[PDB]
Amino acid sequence: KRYVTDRRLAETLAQIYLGHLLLECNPGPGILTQALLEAGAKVVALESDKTFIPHLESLGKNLDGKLRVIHCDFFKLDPRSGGVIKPPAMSSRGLFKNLGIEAVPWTADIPLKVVGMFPSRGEKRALWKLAYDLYSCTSIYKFGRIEVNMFIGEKEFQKLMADPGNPDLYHVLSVIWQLACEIKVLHMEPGSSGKLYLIQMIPRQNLFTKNLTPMNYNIFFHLLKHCFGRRSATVIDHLRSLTPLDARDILMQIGKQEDEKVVNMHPQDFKTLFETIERSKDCAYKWLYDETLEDR
């Protein structure tokens, strides 16, 4: 996987993350773990690979920093469907209970911070998994607006931050994550394998509204996947397969013309579109949701 192995980078990250409890994912050799402890951090190591645990546990006995090491793969917590039957893969409810982490309301301040690096070849998969957890307020997000800082490769970073201003890279996860979080680059590291961006993902206090909730976000995801399935088409073309309501009237309410294209819609335009349909009255039904669309 990806590991912080450069001492100078580790010292830089420690100042970023300190300047509250820290969950470090896949510390590996523990160069960042040691830098965090030297800097005075309180760290819980979630290490997926057992072979690194002896040295990590050696670090906590001898350094002036309370360290707890758990054999836990953060990216396998609370499988979206499955039986929780894997030693390294666990439930966040059981982990957070053992760690004494208490849930707080969505509106409250950040209870906890998670830091690490996305897997080099599972970035989209991980972003989808976290997005489902976030919008549903399950897994770690059952406990509040968890701050997540993750290194990501440049290609997926540029796609995540794209919008109508850069249409060629604009896709479903761009909308999902820009609505969910204010995303900021905390560091950029040039590695032999390509540029890595450390992005800070703090869930927005105002993500959820009267009409976008943890109970109906899946309909919103369906709208987005449907639209970006034919990204060059008009929004009205897609709406005719999404809602029985008058698609032209809907678009007018959000200030868009009939010929508006999917790729010209900003993330907030999609949110207002979804809320506008949800708002409508005297309707036996607002959506034609009858199919499961793949995560792309």
Q: Are 274 and 250 in contact (CB under 8 A)?
A: no
Which of these ranges, 20-28, 92-100, 197-205, 238-246, lies near Cl ion under the rule CB under 5 A? 238-246
* Contact region with Cl ion (CB under 5 A), list: 21-29, 41-49, 239-247, 274-282: 239-247
47 is in an annotated binding site: yes
- Name the DSSP class of 161: T
Nearer to Cl ion, 199 or 247 (CB): 247
| HSE toward the beta carbon, residue 77, CA cutoff 13 A | 23
Say whether 172 counts as a known binding-site residue: no
User: How distant, in Å, are the alpha carbons of 110, 161, 271, 280 from that of 217?
Assistant: 22, 21, 11, 17
DSSP letter assigned to residue 293: -
Between residues 123 and 278, which has the closer beta carbon with respect to Cl ion?
A: 278
Residue 287 contacts Cl ion per CB under 5 A: yes
Burial 239-275 (b: 16+ CB within 10 A, else e): beebbebebeebbeebebeeebbbbbbebebbbbbbe
CB of 269 to Cl ion, least distance (A): 18
Structure tokens at 281: 């009255």
Given the rule CB under 5 A, which of 33-41, 132-140, 242-250, 258-266 is the region that contacts Cl ion? 242-250
Helix (H, G, I), strand (E, B) or coil at 142: helix
Given the complex with Cl ion, which of 120 and 211 has the nearer CB atom? Answer: 211
Burial of 228 (0-12, 13-18, 19+ CB in 10 A): buried
CB neighbours (10 Å) of residue 138?
15
> Could you say whether residue 244 binds Cl ion (CB under 5 A)?
no
Residue 168 annotated as binding site: no
**Residue choice 62, 190, 255, 285 for contact with Cl ion (CB under 5 A):** 285
Window 245-274: residues binding Cl ion (CB under 5 A): 246-247
222 forms part of the interface with Cl ion (CB under 5 A): no
**C-alpha 104: how far from chain center:** 19
Helix, strand or coil for residue 27?
A: coil
CB of 277 to Cl ion, least distance (A): 9
Closest residue by Cα to residue 23 from 143, 149, 123: 149
| Segment contacting Cl ion by CB under 5 A, of 41-49, 106-114, 244-252, 271-279 | 244-252
Residue 192 sits at the vertex; the CA angle it makes with 186 and 197, to the nearest 5 degrees, is 15
Q: Which is nearer to Cl ion, 180 or 247 (CB)?
A: 247
* Host H or E run for residue 29: none
Q: Is there binding between residue 286 and Cl ion (CB under 5 A)?
A: yes
Minimum distance from CB of 237 to Cl ion (Å)?
A: 10
Binding range to Cl ion, per CB under 5 A, among 47-55, 118-126, 166-174, 285-293: 285-293
Is residue 171 involved in binding Cl ion (CB under 5 A)?
no
Footprint on this chain of Cl ion (rule: CB under 5 A): 246-247, 285-287
Annotated binding site for S-adenosyl-L-methionine: 4, 47, 73
